[PDB]
Structure formats: structure tokens, C-alpha cells
Design an enzyme around this catalytic site. Structure first.
Site, PDB file in Angstrom:
ATOM      1  N   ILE C  18     -13.498  19.897  20.847  1.00 12.83           N
ATOM      2  CA  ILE C  18     -13.474  19.330  22.248  1.00 12.83           C
ATOM      3  C   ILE C  18     -14.942  19.167  22.447  1.00 12.83           C
ATOM      4  O   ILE C  18     -15.321  18.113  23.351  1.00 12.83           O
ATOM      5  CB  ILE C  18     -13.073  20.457  23.191  1.00 12.83           C
ATOM      6  CG1 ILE C  18     -11.332  20.423  23.005  1.00 12.83           C
ATOM      7  CG2 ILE C  18     -13.337  20.214  24.619  1.00 12.83           C
ATOM      8  CD1 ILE C  18     -10.712  21.728  23.727  1.00 12.83           C
ATOM      9  N   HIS C  39     -24.760  27.047  13.844  1.00  8.30           N
ATOM     10  CA  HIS C  39     -24.933  26.615  12.262  1.00  8.30           C
ATOM     11  C   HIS C  39     -25.697  25.236  12.334  1.00  8.30           C
ATOM     12  O   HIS C  39     -25.420  24.121  12.810  1.00  8.30           O
ATOM     13  CB  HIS C  39     -23.650  26.417  11.685  1.00  8.30           C
ATOM     14  CG  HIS C  39     -22.891  27.858  11.724  1.00  8.30           C
ATOM     15  ND1 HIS C  39     -21.498  27.763  12.250  1.00  8.30           N
ATOM     16  CD2 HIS C  39     -23.156  29.248  11.331  1.00  8.30           C
ATOM     17  CE1 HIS C  39     -20.999  29.221  12.363  1.00  8.30           C
ATOM     18  NE2 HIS C  39     -22.005  29.914  11.741  1.00  8.30           N
ATOM     19  N   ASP C  62     -26.647  30.646  20.512  1.00  7.78           N
ATOM     20  CA  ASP C  62     -25.408  31.468  20.629  1.00  7.78           C
ATOM     21  C   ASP C  62     -25.330  31.740  22.385  1.00  7.78           C
ATOM     22  O   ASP C  62     -26.504  32.231  22.880  1.00  7.78           O
ATOM     23  CB  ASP C  62     -25.655  32.887  19.979  1.00  7.78           C
ATOM     24  CG  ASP C  62     -24.604  33.650  20.559  1.00  7.78           C
ATOM     25  OD1 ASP C  62     -23.746  33.710  21.192  1.00  7.78           O
ATOM     26  OD2 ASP C  62     -24.683  34.628  19.489  1.00  7.78           O
ATOM     27  N   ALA C  63     -24.411  31.064  22.945  1.00  7.19           N
ATOM     28  CA  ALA C  63     -24.258  31.099  24.364  1.00  7.19           C
ATOM     29  C   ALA C  63     -24.192  32.458  24.843  1.00  7.19           C
ATOM     30  O   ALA C  63     -24.553  32.441  25.860  1.00  7.19           O
ATOM     31  CB  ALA C  63     -22.849  30.457  24.783  1.00  7.19           C
ATOM     32  N   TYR C 155      -8.683  36.805  25.998  1.00  6.61           N
ATOM     33  CA  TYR C 155      -8.997  35.495  26.196  1.00  6.61           C
ATOM     34  C   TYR C 155      -8.501  35.111  27.745  1.00  6.61           C
ATOM     35  O   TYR C 155      -9.508  34.549  28.361  1.00  6.61           O
ATOM     36  CB  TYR C 155      -8.318  34.448  25.410  1.00  6.61           C
ATOM     37  CG  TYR C 155      -8.494  32.991  25.365  1.00  6.61           C
ATOM     38  CD1 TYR C 155      -9.776  32.676  24.494  1.00  6.61           C
ATOM     39  CD2 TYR C 155      -7.668  32.161  25.763  1.00  6.61           C
ATOM     40  CE1 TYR C 155     -10.094  31.465  24.691  1.00  6.61           C
ATOM     41  CE2 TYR C 155      -7.777  30.944  25.821  1.00  6.61           C
ATOM     42  CZ  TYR C 155      -9.013  30.150  25.042  1.00  6.61           C
ATOM     43  OH  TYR C 155      -9.435  29.088  25.432  1.00  6.61           O
ATOM     44  N   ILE C 190      -4.992  21.533  21.912  1.00  5.30           N
ATOM     45  CA  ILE C 190      -5.672  20.185  21.409  1.00  5.30           C
ATOM     46  C   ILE C 190      -5.823  20.371  20.117  1.00  5.30           C
ATOM     47  O   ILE C 190      -6.264  21.453  19.384  1.00  5.30           O
ATOM     48  CB  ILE C 190      -7.160  20.062  22.191  1.00  5.30           C
ATOM     49  CG1 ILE C 190      -7.083  20.120  23.836  1.00  5.30           C
ATOM     50  CG2 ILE C 190      -7.692  18.952  21.690  1.00  5.30           C
ATOM     51  CD1 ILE C 190      -6.268  18.684  24.207  1.00  5.30           C
ATOM     52  N   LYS C 191      -5.648  19.152  19.151  1.00  9.72           N
ATOM     53  CA  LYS C 191      -5.629  19.157  17.799  1.00  9.72           C
ATOM     54  C   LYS C 191      -7.106  18.952  17.322  1.00  9.72           C
ATOM     55  O   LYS C 191      -7.983  18.185  17.832  1.00  9.72           O
ATOM     56  CB  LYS C 191      -4.737  17.945  17.511  1.00  9.72           C
ATOM     57  CG  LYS C 191      -4.735  17.533  15.945  1.00  9.72           C
ATOM     58  CD  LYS C 191      -4.057  16.643  15.519  1.00  9.72           C
ATOM     59  CE  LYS C 191      -3.498  16.806  14.077  1.00  9.72           C
ATOM     60  NZ  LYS C 191      -4.626  17.194  13.012  1.00  9.72           N
ATOM     61  N   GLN C 251       5.761  23.959  34.006  1.00  5.01           N
ATOM     62  CA  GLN C 251       7.091  24.365  33.883  1.00  5.01           C
ATOM     63  C   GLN C 251       6.723  25.845  33.984  1.00  5.01           C
ATOM     64  O   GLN C 251       5.672  26.342  33.693  1.00  5.01           O
ATOM     65  CB  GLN C 251       7.909  23.950  32.640  1.00  5.01           C
ATOM     66  CG  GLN C 251       7.120  24.238  31.357  1.00  5.01           C
ATOM     67  CD  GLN C 251       7.842  23.748  30.300  1.00  5.01           C
ATOM     68  OE1 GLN C 251       8.874  22.944  30.206  1.00  5.01           O
ATOM     69  NE2 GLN C 251       7.376  24.016  29.298  1.00  5.01           N
TER      70      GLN C 251
HETATM   71 MG   LIG Z   1       5.166  28.261  33.194  1.00  5.98          MG
END
Ligand SMILES: [Mg+2]
Ligand SMILES: [Mg+2]
Ligand SMILES: [Mg+2]
Ligand SMILES: [Mg+2]
Lengths: 251, 251, 251, 251
Positions: C18, C39, C62-63, C155, C190-191, C251
Site C-alpha cells: 500500500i 531495509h 523505524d516509525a 491491532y 488488499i492484495k 454489512q
Molecule cells: Mg459488519
């Protein structure tokens, strides 16, 4: 048990399912209750199943019937004194996508689910304001007021409308010191006579991808949050959304 | 500039304010556009102010006019080919609390703000699905779809309805692989000809307790998020809410 | 034609997925960009894969490294002039329920995902305020900032924090007329090559009960909403949440 | 008649204000309660002000003290039997914008408000799962978990984190049939002796642009929604947010 001491409540669609349980626990907690429905035999039976006419009565009324709302309030007040609590619970559901919804279905559902809640909220404010009643309007607004369902287009529209209209009413009442609170309750899937009829309905609703608890709720689950909202326990709660859905909207 | 290359858009209420700016930037980005409004002279003038009939045309239409929607799509397709983009922007506002809203005002506002958006969304899906058009329906749903305003009862109801109905449509289109996205845009206060007329309106809207930026937006502010949503740039965005409000809902 | 004329952007975690796409489209739209990563070989190659050193450079950072943030801004400014845009995209994920999260895992994830975004936002405001740069801070805040996931406890915590902290910053900047906007972007699945690594991940993510579109997105899907937010097109958008998720949260 | 028959609750930060009232009404409804705080004299007096040692006790504990949490559960269980209810109410506030927040302030606040709630939730699930206790974890998550405040940067971060982390925990518990529910409570402005200390605080908080009701709440306002959430009345409510704020978030 007297958490609703002195309260006088109108519960629309109160002869069945969620509305019936709300009425049941309201009476249990000391409220006087009028329940409405469109069928007299069913309705009279429902009322008597909860108590005598000194605590609960049935009135035949279609929530979409505007003139009937005034008659309903007058009747309730004549029976039990000034109304303190309005539960706008009458509603219908249509299983159609937006694409497949006929205009007839659209208008019919919204006349009950949206116009009916408007009529009850508007009249509720007019009739209960400035009376020091600790008045409370509780509008039933569904998980379908939060998230879409591809098979519930008109229903989603009606419940989203109720959700935000109720915020408007809550703010106006608060700002004008009306002593009227307005809040919405958002049931997830609940076992009702209507759900039991539809073959496979409970099974669909009980999938973990729908309801994380893996089963649907019961009408008393909604009754108890309504008791809280009708009671003076919730006197600082207004314009808010109370979701009882087994985790449906959390994922 | 060609971010909307090949797109064909209907923009309702596109002769004034926000709708006009949407139409303006759509044409700028290569879309063909039909704008609607209820006044021919105003509407024809608006269209020509943006471009010639090879890129933009006016059609006199009331969004609450159901039969007119079919005529509108047919006219647009005859002019520019298959419709790819529908912006349901036509709407009115009434400054009444829920308590003070007449049933006439209630029905009139909802016929435009809710029924109109339903008609456009429903027909949009029927007419644009399965054609590989990268179709996009953009429903105008306001900060009043998120938060209440004591003076905007019916308006709140309509915008909450649009907000969640659009999620239903987005899900159905996604699940059925229709190649149609549905999203909502939520403007805060925007400087329009309507706002300019109401003495003191911009002043009220510009208070920091309302809009943190301390001023209201401009129609192009809404046009550019609409360009994003109409474009294939937003091909993974559906069922979502895009708020452009100077910080109104963040506090 | 360039939508980010004159902008100077820091994109953390900008060497892969991303972040890489955000950097790529930023450069395409005329921004100068510094991308960060831990890196050096990967990062230098990544920068050169997008453009020349006159428009994009890599800085190893490094953030979670607070002192490194000041160095990062100084380096970027020496290369390209005053920073106008900060994309806080660096982050990690841990697949553990709250119950099963070790305190070490908790602290490690929050040090990057929460502390890093705080460091970048705080310094961004300090360094960019009052300079009339049309400055924009874009904080990456996930669908996991809206809804829970039983396997993403820490997360979820970090992304909820970013979501609301960003509103605080947006408001302060708006109320003080700082010429800095703060918004959050909320990607669904996301792929990326990393997702490709985890066998069966894309299949799980593409289930209709997860992503209604039945497929996952691509990094450019997130790049284009970030271009909008970085550009002056979005000058009235602040304190808002932009969700690009294939219908996940609808949904 | 007791609504919390058999329950055993830990209420962190339970010696003052909101926490004290939660403990008070929990005991009133038949729960056994351990309250925590950092000050022994205040805390012991607080416990005795509510009831006898057979229903309420004080334990000195810093919610950021991870090892102390295991000790706390052990002590509570030795006194009253298996814990059924955890109210993570301990917290602090810092009045700083994100821009002006020192890293020391950031870390200190998050250590209590976020790490403390994590420690209590994680241990609560571990200690209460699968025991059929009707267990309930109630995380205090503020109106600041919903909307930003320019002067509450770190606080906003912590409360957003609690809001979404709690959904993760609720889902995991629900999906695993753990007999543990997790919900968040979101107080608006509440009158405490501490608020009384800050001159002009209540006046600021009572402005209609902050609290539409024109006054702030009282600790019992938060106590009663917690009684509902701790009770088996709310057995279908999980992963949800309960806002008691006088209308703050409705506008
Ligand atoms: Mg839902
Ligand atoms: Mg490129
Ligand atoms: Mg007591
Ligand atoms: Mg607000």
C-alpha cells in the site's frame, strides 16, 4: 420490583413478540401500559395474558393511521393518566432488494415504519413536554439502522430514518428543557412468532458470520433495555443508540 | 484531464449549487452529463454555462416524479449512450423540529429526498448492471445523515434513510457481481445560492462550535469527492460514507 | 494537470504494498516523496522503481524511533523543501486474540502502529502549521479501526486509537487555522506480495461474508484516495474517515 | 429482587466518582465488589461508606501494574469466590493537544487507560471463561472514544483503542461460547468532586453546544447502565457501545 413506578406507556405493535415482552416487563416494573395491534381477539388475549385492565389495556390501532394516534393518546390518558412513555415498536419487514422493491411495497413499509414512528414521536413530544413526567420516547430502529442488508432495502431506509430522526427529536427536547428523552433501540435477530413461521429463518440468523453468539435472541432481551430507557435510571441518556444484537454489528 | 473518460452521468438537482459544480467537474474530467431541475430557463442556462450539448444537456424533471425517471434515463441514453453514473443530489430542506413538522411538510420533503433517491437508485441498478460500465451511484446523504439537528427533523429522517438504504443497494450489487457501486456523500455546510438568500445562515454555519474551520465550504468541495467516486479510481469503494464537512462531525 | 503540484510527502512504510503505491501515485501527480522502511537494499530499489532522485528518495527509519522522526523531516526538507504531506502508513499486525496476546506483542505492535502515528502526527503539525502549504496528514487506520476481529486484538486497539486521535488533531488544527488537515484512511483487505505469501489468505478474505465484492483490493485502490486527501481538492475535508473495503463494513 | 444476584465484581478506580457509584449500585443489587485505588486511607473509607466487608472491600492497585492484576483477582476470589464481572474504570486525563503532548504524558496516560484496560480484559477472559458465570467485562470508553477533542489528544487515543479492542474481545468470547460478554460505556460530562475542583469546568461542560441538556450528569447515571450490563438482563448484548452523555454525541 418498581423501576417504572408511576409511568404510563404506549407500546405500539405490543400484542406480539418484542412489543409483547416490553409490555410484560413494563407492567412487572409498575408501569401502566396500553398495547396496540390490528387484531382485536389477538390483542385482547395478549393484554389479559399480562394483567387486568387496571395495569394493561389493548387498543386496536394501525401506527400508520395518523388520526388514530390522537385517539390513542386520549384513550390512554383517560385510562391511566398522563402518558409518560412511548415505545414506537410497530413495524413490518419486506424481503426485497432495493432493485426489486415495488413502489407499493416501499410506500407501505415506510408508512408504518417511518411515518408511524414520526406520528408517535411528534405527538409524544407535544403531549408529554413540560409536565415533569420524566418522559421517554423509545424508537425501535434495528441493526438495520446501522448496517445494510441486500434483501432489506426499504427496511434499511426506514430504520436509518428512525435512527437519525430520533437524534433530532432528542436534541430539540433537550435544548428546550421539555423533560422528554428520545433514544433508539437496535435489536439484532430475535426469536418472534414471525421468525418461527419462516422456515429456515432462525438457521440463517444463527450463523456465526451473522450473529457471533451463534443463536438469536429472545423478546425479553429487548424488553430489559427498554425498561432501562423508560426508567429515570437513564435520565442523562438521550439521542443515543442501544444495540442488543449478539455481536452482529461488532464484526 | 480525463479521469471520467467514457462516463455518462445523470446529476439530479444539477442546475444549482452543489449539483452544478458536480456537473461542471464531471464534464471537465471527460464525462457526458445530463442535469435535471424544475425550471427550464434556469436549467438551459446552467447547462450552456458549462458546455455545449455534445457534453452536457438539461432535462426538466422533478426527482419525486417516478414515471419521469424512466423518461430521464431514456433521454440520457439517446443523447450519450448507456448511463454509467447516477448522482442523486436533488433535495429540499425544511427548517422545522420534529414537533413542529406538519404532515404535509413531512411527505413533501420525503417524496424528494427519500423517494427520489430510491427511484434513482432502483432504476440505476436495473439499467446499469452487468454491462461492464464501472457503474457508480452516488447518493447525497448530508452530515444530517450522521448527526441530529433540532431544526431539521424531516431532513434528518430523509438523510438517515438514504445513508443506510445505500448500504443495502451496495451490498446487493456487490454480492450479485453487478459492476455497480453505491456510496454516499455527506456535505457539511456549503455556500449555495440557497444559503446566500437566508440572512444570517452562513454566519450561523460558520461558528466554530458548528464548523471547526470557521467557515462554510464551496460547491467544488463536494464536486471533487464525487469525481473520485464516479471514477474507476474508487473501484473497491462501495457501501461507504464520504464526509466533507470542515470538521463538523469530528467533534 | 498534476493534482499534487508542489507537495512534498513523507510516506512511512513506503517500500512495499500500500505504501509503495501511495508513493507511486503521489510522484505521478507531481509530489516529491520520501519513503521509509527498515531495509536499505529493498528501500533504495523501491524508490528507483518509481522515479528519479529528483522526485523520490528512500530513508531508512523505524516509525517507532522517536528521535529518527526529527532526522527524517530534516532530511526530507533538505532534499525537497518544506514537508506538506505526511502519510503514517508504517504498521505491523499480530494474529492473536486479546486473550492470547503477550504483553511483549502488545507493546511491540503499539510502538509502531500507535506511537509511530502519534510521533508523525505531532511532528507533522509542529513542522507544517502556519506555512500555507495546504498540509495534509493521512493516518492509516484500517477497517480494524471500525469493527473488531477476534484474531486481531492489539491491532484493533491500535487502529481505534489512530481513528480517534486523528479527529483530535484535525480539530485542533482547524480551530487554530493551522492550514493542516488530518484524516484517516481505512483499507479493507488488499492484495500484496505479503498476503500472497500466507497460503489461503486471499481466499479467506474474498469470501462474501468478509468482502461482499468477492475479491480483495489492490494497493492502487488506497493510493487514489490518498491522492485526493493530499490534494487541495479536499481542502474542506478534515477529521473524517475514508473507507475503501469492498463492502466489508457495510454489512 | 436483586438484579446482580451472585455476581462478584472488580471495579478499578472504584474509590471516587463514577467508579464509586458503580460499586455502590452493584452492592445495592446484590453483587460482592472489590474496588481499587492507589490510596489506602481513601479507599478503605470508601469501601466502608458503601457496605460491610461481607459485600465490599478495597484493594490498593495501580491498573497499569500488570503483576498486580493477578494478585487482585486472587484476592477478590479468596474473599468472595470466582469473579464474574470486571469494570475497567481506572483512568487519567491530560489536557494537551496532540501537538503539545509530551512523550512522557503520552506513555503515562496510555499505561493506565489502555494497558490497564488490556490487562483487565485479558485476565478477565482467562479467569472467567467457560465457568457459566454470566460474566461481563465493562470497559469505560468515554464520549472521547467517539468524537475528538482538540485538548484531549492522548485521552482520545486511549478511548478509541478501548472502544475497538473491546469489540475484538467480545467477538472472540462470543464465537468461542466463553460465557463472557464485553461492552463499552461512554460517559459524557459527569459531576464529580474532582470536576468541582476545577473552577469553571461544570459551566463549560453545561453549555448547550457541549451538552444539549444544559447540565452535566451524575455518577449514578453511569452506575445504572453498568448494572444493566453486569446483569443477565443483557445476556444478548456484546461488542456494543452504551452512551450516556446528555446528548453530546447526538449533535
Ligand atoms: Mg459488519
Ligand atoms: Mg509510477
Ligand atoms: Mg448504597
Ligand atoms: Mg458532534
Amino acid at each position: 420490583t418498581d423501576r417504572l413506578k408511576g409511568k404510563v406507556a404506549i407500546v405500539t405493535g405490543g400484542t406480539l413478540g418484542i412489543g409483547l415482552a416490553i409490555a410484560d416487563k413494563f407492567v412487572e416494573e409498575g408501569a401502566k401500559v396500553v398495547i396496540t395491534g390490528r387484531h382485536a381477539d389477538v390483542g385482547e388475549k395478549a393484554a389479559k395474558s399480562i394483567g387486568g385492565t387496571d395495569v394493561i389495556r389493548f387498543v386496536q390501532h394501525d401506527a400508520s393511521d395518523e388520526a388514530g394516534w390522537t385517539k390513542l393518546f386520549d384513550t390512554t390518558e383517560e385510562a391511566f393518566g398522563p402518558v409518560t412513555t412511548v415505545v414506537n415498536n410497530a413495524g413490518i419487514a419486506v424481503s426485497k432488494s432495493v432493485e426489486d422493491t415495488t413502489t407499493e411495497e416501499w410506500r407501505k413499509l415506510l408508512s408504518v415504519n417511518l411515518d408511524g414512528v414520526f406520528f408517535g414521536t411528534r405527538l409524544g413530544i407535544q403531549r408529554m413536554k413540560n409536565k415533569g413526567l420524566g418522559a421517554s420516547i423509545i424508537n425501535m430502529s434495528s441493526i438495520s439502522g446501522f448496517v445494510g442488508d441486500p434483501t432489506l432495502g426499504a427496511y434499511n431506509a426506514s430504520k436509518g430514518a428512525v435512527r437519525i430522526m430520533s437524534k433530532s427529536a432528542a436534541l430539540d427536547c433537550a435544548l428546550k428543557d421539555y423533560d422528554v428523552r428520545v433514544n433508539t433501540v437496535h435489536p439484532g435477530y430475535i426469536k418472534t412468532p414471525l421468525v418461527d413461521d419462516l422456515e429456515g429463518a432462525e438457521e440463517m440468523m444463527s450463523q456465526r458470520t451473522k450473529t457471533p453468539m451463534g443463536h438469536i435472541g429472545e423478546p425479553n432481551d429487548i424488553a430489559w433495555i427498554c425498561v432501562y430507557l423508560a426508567s429515570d435510571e437513564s435520565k442523562f441518556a438521550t439521542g443515543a443508540e442501544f444495540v442488543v444484537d449478539g455481536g452482529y454489528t461488532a464484526q
